Write a protein that binds this ligand. Structure first.
Ligand SMILES: CC[C@H](C)[C@H](N)C(=O)O
Ligand SMILES: CC[C@H](C)[C@H](N)C(=O)O
Ligand SMILES: [Fe+2]
Ligand SMILES: [Fe+2]
Lengths: 258, 258
């Protein structure tokens, strides 16, 4: 339980390395290179996929926290478990209640600020006007990779380590995705005009960029892990979850290169 | 779904009326009358029971929030559900992370401030020194009424309406319990001396008094309820939960009058 914590963290980054999730390796982040004016339709398709992915992420992570809590009503928890418990609760509050100042400063109030709602409202909606009603059945269909990620989430919703796994993996990729979104949606043209013209139209993306970059410079999630039996399962779950995340982001990449 | 909300709330207070939970009706709050120097042992017994009751309350309510969340990953939720979702998350943050200013101002930092921890540390511990190691097996035994409340909590942990039920019932009785605790522990004598001498030794109790009184003057939980099928079940669950809460508080009362 001593260097064990250090090895778990280093192994987890190894799993994320291997899953091809790093800035350099995942095809989606190369969307920067795809100056090819992202089609409004391509932007809509990814935006609608992302809406469900982030909605599921938030709800199944809160569900995963509830699952842990179920167990600790009875079992006595060390001060270290309780602190990681608190951390998970705090971190989840960003997506559900804009708890962090980088978000509350700018996000809409109340349920309008739930990040899958805020995203649906300022990204999915503008692009819908520029996409035909028949064309919107291309997103109504979620590719197997994206459906596999959502089902991994559903499983982790019921797993005593699911919150820890989802937050640990997503926090490492969150900035690259948010920068990928600012690049790709900055290249959506309607007869040569940016659908997303002004800076304020990017509020969601830039609050995440800000929140995430300052985070990665001021440094645990694995604090929930106690037995080496748990650490083994954590890595196993991380392997599965990171892999699904990468192939889902690959669908974003293929979408940009039809 | 219109006056339906109003009737649900009024019926819920009727159920709490009937369960004999109001200040006037539940035997525990009459502890004020029990000037009979509360025995340290009596204080210890109730404190240890309360520790588990509040620990279970917090964890099974968070668990109940996770259960709701499980469902809403997939199902589309109206802006009203989402707002009640946010409210439950906020309210739970008091007990888990001293979210409200009345608490963060005064509570210990980090896991030390989780209210069942903070209570164990400043109420259970002082009284333990004044209670013999053999005598502490009177609390190690939880009376059926208190065990029945804990099991109701465990069931509600897995119920899509459990959080709503627990928070709705507990918020109506929270001030009376906290005042009952300030009265009863102000009357614990060790050879004629207050075990709890100074005002600072009452920090936990008084933060709750403050947080709860200001709350009851600045006015929903049932926002989670949609169908009349849910409202019916809500009242049913409230009937069961309030009844268990009252008999558990009756065990506190009997304990003070051995
Ligand atoms: C998957 C979650 C990402 C990183 C971000 N928190 C959001 O609101 O979508
Ligand atoms: C049952 C919960 C009570 C009212 C209080 N919130 C506590 O910390 O114990
Ligand atoms: Fe977010
Ligand atoms: Fe509390």
């Amino acid at each position: 339980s001593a260097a064990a914590r250090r090895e778990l963290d280093e192994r987890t980054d190894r799993e994320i390395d291997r899953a091809r999730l790093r800035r350099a390796d995942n095809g989606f982040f190369g969307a920067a290179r795809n100056a090819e004016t992202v089609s409004a339709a391509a932007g809509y398709t990814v935006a609608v996929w992302w809406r469900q992915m982030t909605k599921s992420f938030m709800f199944t992570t809160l569900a995963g926290l509830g699952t842990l809590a179920r167990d600790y009503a009875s079992r006595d928890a060390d001060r270290e478990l309780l602190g990681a418990f608190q951390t998970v609760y705090q971190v989840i509050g960003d997506d559900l209640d804009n708890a962090a100042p980088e978000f509350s400063a700018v996000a809409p109030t109340g349920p309008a600020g739930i990040h899958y709602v805020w995203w649906d409202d300022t990204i999915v909606a503008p692009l819908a006007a520029h996409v035909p009603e028949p064309d919107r059945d291309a997103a109504a269909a979620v590719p197997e990779p994206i459906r596999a990620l959502l089902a991994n989430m559903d499983r982790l919703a019921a797993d005593p380590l699911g919150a820890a796994v989802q937050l640990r993996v997503v926090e490492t990729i969150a900035l690259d995705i948010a920068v990928g979104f600012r690049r790709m949606y900055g290249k959506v043209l309607v007869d040569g005009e940016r659908v997303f013209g002004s800076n304020d139209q990017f509020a969601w993306i830039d609050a995440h960029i800000k929140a995430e970059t300052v985070h990665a410079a001021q440094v645990g999630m694995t604090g929930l892990v106690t037995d080496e039996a748990q650490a083994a399962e954590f890595v196993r779950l991380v392997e599965e979850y990171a892999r699904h995340w990468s192939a889902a982001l690959e669908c974003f990449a293929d979408c940009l290169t039809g």
